[PDB]
Amino acid sequence: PRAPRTYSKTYSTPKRPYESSRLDAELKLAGEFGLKNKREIYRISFQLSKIRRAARDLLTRDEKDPKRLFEGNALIRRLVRVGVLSEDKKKLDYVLALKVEDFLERRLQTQVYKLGLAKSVHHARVLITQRHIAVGKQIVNIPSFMVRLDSEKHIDFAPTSPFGGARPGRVARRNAARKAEA
Amino acid sequence: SDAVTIRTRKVISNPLLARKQFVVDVLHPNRANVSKDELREKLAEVYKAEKDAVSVFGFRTQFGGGKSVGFGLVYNSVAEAKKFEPTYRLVRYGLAEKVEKASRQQRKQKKNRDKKIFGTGKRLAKKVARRNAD
Amino acid sequence: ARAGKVKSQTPKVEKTEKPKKPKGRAYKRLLYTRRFVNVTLVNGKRRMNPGPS
Amino acid sequence: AKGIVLEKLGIESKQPNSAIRKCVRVQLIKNGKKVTAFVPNDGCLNFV
RNA sequence: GGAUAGUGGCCUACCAUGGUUUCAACGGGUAACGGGGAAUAAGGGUUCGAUUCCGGAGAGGGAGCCUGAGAAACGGCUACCACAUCCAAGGAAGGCAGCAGGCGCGCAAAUUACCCAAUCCUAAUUCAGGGAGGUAGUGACAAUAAAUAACGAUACAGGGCCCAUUCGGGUCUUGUAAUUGGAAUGAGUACAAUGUAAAUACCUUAACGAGGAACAAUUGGAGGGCAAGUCUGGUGCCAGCAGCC
């Protein structure tokens, strides 16, 4: 007995669990970005639900009040640095209509896809998780990185990992040693 | 080749413990885990001190590799090293020998045993012998 | 009659060996390409599991 | 709860249905009350 | 007045007859230790809190008491009640609701492991000690992240377009194919170094480790609520399924 280490859960199961429209919508915006399960979308939906409650909390009260000004600007700054808002939408009313899609357009696999050298995003997810894509002097195996609008320029392949230069195989060395006898 | 480059950042000078306390910052590229023995060797040159007078620990190769981050102590002399360095570190460096004493459960057993015999139990060892003729 | 008759009766036809279903993400790649890309022709609502229509 | 099975029972279903419900009467280890538990699948009365 | 470290019906003696209560006294119950908090989430709430912190209580059940600054202490003593030991029958020793472990009780819970290296505590006290406490083991109670495949070539299809001279040249793309070919990585495994008190595990890495039969992902469902068959074989108010109809 020392002290309770704080854990919290990031996902949330939808209220009515069989619904043609929701199932259609979720499979679509899972098939677009090449996700593994529906909890990916439930998590992004939970994160946006936390932001929206934090937004309404700061909105309902007085305007030009230090609490609204400080916490509002902190959130907007954090979101515009993620890339979920752009330069010209920093009003704390744009944030309230933020479309989980926008967060899903900023995962590492989506960025690896959209910056080329990725060939269909299911290759981009398997690339990342196979220790290939390093942001900059730093590998990332997480296909839910949330790229932060300054690593967009520096993101590339690792110094290691062929796609890179250092490592030439693990299967190529095999084929080299097998075709060495001719 | 590798050409491993070391950087001793966040230096605090400590004249109390006769120390240079710093964060060792190693680059590995094309190898990893540069052998704390070799680290002390090539850290002896940066402070022209004897390699028995420098101590490093907790290197922890970073995720993806190519880099390690340890904490490194340099002493003014080896006599000071032995005075202030804990014995476990001194045996890792091979200067002091680890006292190979009895297992803690045997030590706790025999102190609980010696709780009973009052004083030097010689006059009790002179009964256990002389009560065998009854 | 007595317990376990219709199970002790039923002619157990065994399962057929097939190629597996590719688990995880690849299964959602299949479920996407089989519903929102190459779906069976719609009359009113799509029929997900019809026999010989 | 846990219990030791006294008897095998054939309880007759209520009126719109018709079957023998393959129950088991069981004395509770916990307190000593005798209850009647259902065996929850096809040929499981032969298993208990 | 006595006693107490001290205040006090705290106790004693002598007086008065007071004091609480339908704003719930008193009595009974609690599968009630209180609180910081916890779960659920429009707002208002409801339910819970033995359990990482704070406080109170107890060390089988009552009572008593010595030693001490501090105890009505229980890994201190004494007596009685309960239960229990060894006994050579005269005696002797007991107190795990500390750690681990065994019974029992049960729907229901772990190793008779390693260490003072960290956090601190105690001492005549830098060194000694510490089942406090940490380390490993068991561990799908919960919680976080996320493998179980990706890519082209070869043969069929379809879908936007030139004129629909019947032409289709298919010049682009969305797939289908038991056809196909190279690149990828850990899951494992192991020199090593790192980690550590010592180790294990992670982190990083020599060498090895993917080809459908695999390195094989299940669990619950397909009348309705409720996503998903009016498809085959069997049973024939039986066997059964069925939270509800």
Q: Are A166 and A159 in contact (CB under 8 A)?
A: yes
User: Residue B59, Cβ neighbours under 10 Å: how many?
Assistant: 19
Q: Over the range B22-54, which residues count as b (16 or more CB within 10 Å of their CB) and which as e?
A: bebbbebbeebebebeebbeebbeebebeebbb
Contacts of C4 (CB under 8 A, 6+ apart): D42, D43, D44, D45, D46
Distance CA B38, CA B32 (A): 12
Joined together, the tokens standing for residue A38 give 């529906």
Nucleotide in closest CA–C1' contact with B31: E205
Q: Which backbone phi and psi does A94 adopt, to 5 degrees?
A: -60, -45
How many Cα atoms occupy the beta-carbon half-sphere of B39 within 13 Å? 28
A134 backbone dihedrals φ, ψ, rounded to 5°: -105, 130
Nearest to D22, CA basis, from D39, D34, D7, D36: D39
* DSSP type of residue A144: T
Q: For residue B64, is it left (φ>0), alpha (ψ between -120 and 50) or beta?
A: left
- State the CB neighbour count (10 A cutoff) for residue C48: 9
- Placement of tokens 């060792």 in the chain: B24
Q: How many CA atoms lie within 13 A of A147 on its CB side?
A: 26
Q: How far is it, in rounded angstroms, from Cα A9 to Cα A11?
A: 6
- Find where tokens 């043609």 sit: A20
* Phi, psi angle pair for A67, to nearest 5°: -60, -55
Query: Chains D/B: 3 or more C-beta pairs closer than 8 A?
Result: no
Tokens matching residue C2: 């007595």
Residues in chain B: 134
Secondary element (H or E) of residue D27: strand D23-28
D32 touches strand E (CB under 7 A): no
Dist. CA A124–CA A99, nearest whole Å: 23
Q: How far apart are CA A40 and CA A43, in angstroms?
A: 5
Closest by Cα among B73, B110, B109 to B92: B73
Helix (H) or strand (E) holding B106: helix B104-114
Give exposure, D11-43, as e/b (b: 16+ Cβ within 10 Å).
eeeeeeeeeeebbbebeeeeeeeeeeeebeeee
CA-to-CA distance for A157 and A166, rounded, in angstroms? 11
Q: B54-57 and B6-14: which strand pairing?
A: unpaired
How many secondary structure helices (H) and strands (E) does chain B include? Answer: 5, 4
In DSSP terms, A133 is beta-bridged to A157
- The amino acid occupying position A12 is S
- Structural Rg of chain C based on CA atoms: 19
In this structure, are residues A41 and A29 in contact, taking their beta carbons and an 8 Å threshold?
Answer: yes
Under a CB-based contact definition with an 8 Å cutoff, are residues A144 and A37 in contact? no
3-state secondary structure of D37: strand
Specify burial of residue A141 (Cβ count, 10 A radius: 0-12, 13-18, 19+). middle
Q: How far is CA A134 from CA A128, A155, B5, B93, in A?
A: 8, 7, 21, 37
Q: Which residues of A103-126 are buried (b: 16+ CB within 10 A; e: fewer)?
A: bbbbbbbbbbbeeeebeebbebbe
Rg for chain D, CA atoms, rounded: 12
Distance of CA B52 to the CA centre of its chain: 12
Q: Are D3 and D26 spatial neighbours (Cβ–Cβ below 8 Å)?
A: yes
* Measured distance CA(B73)–CA(B9) in Å, rounded: 12
> Where does A61-182 have alpha helices with state H?
66-82, 101-104, 108-114, 121-129, 172-178
Residue corresponding to tokens 């929850």: D40
D30: the nucleotide nearest its CA (via C1') is: E106
Phi, psi of A167 (to 5 degrees): -75, 125
Q: Please state, in angstroms and as integers, the Cα–Cα distance from residue C32 to each residue in A14, A26, D2, following that order.
A: 21, 10, 48
* Resolution in angstrom units: 2.9
β-strand B67-75 against A133-134: which pairing, if any?
Answer: unpaired
Span CA (A110) to C1' (E176), Å = 27
Nucleic acid strand E within 7 Å of B22 CB: no
Contact partners, residue B46, CB within 8 Å, separation at least 6: B6, B8
Residue D38 to residue A113: CA distance in whole angstroms: 57
Distance CA(A125)–CA(C25), nearest Å, equals 9
- Distance, C-alpha D9 to centroid of its chain: 6
A159/B29 Cβ within 8 A:
yes
**In chain A, which residues have their Cβ closer than 8 Å to the Cβ of C32?**
27-28, 30-31
Tell me the three state secondary structure of residue A127: helix
Cβ of C44 near strand E (under 7 Å)? The reply is no
Mutate to test the interface with B, among A160, A161, A167 (most CBs of B within 10 A): A160
Rounded to whole angstroms, what are the CA distances from C49 to A39, C20, C53?
Answer: 26, 19, 10
Query: CA-CA distance, B93 to B37, in Å (whole number)?
Result: 8
Taking Cα atoms as reference points, which of B65, B54, B129, B80 lies closest to residue A159?
B65
Determine whether the distance from the CB of C47 to the nearest atom of strand E is below 7 Å. yes
Q: What are the φ/ψ torsions at residue D4 (nearest 5 degrees)?
A: -110, 125
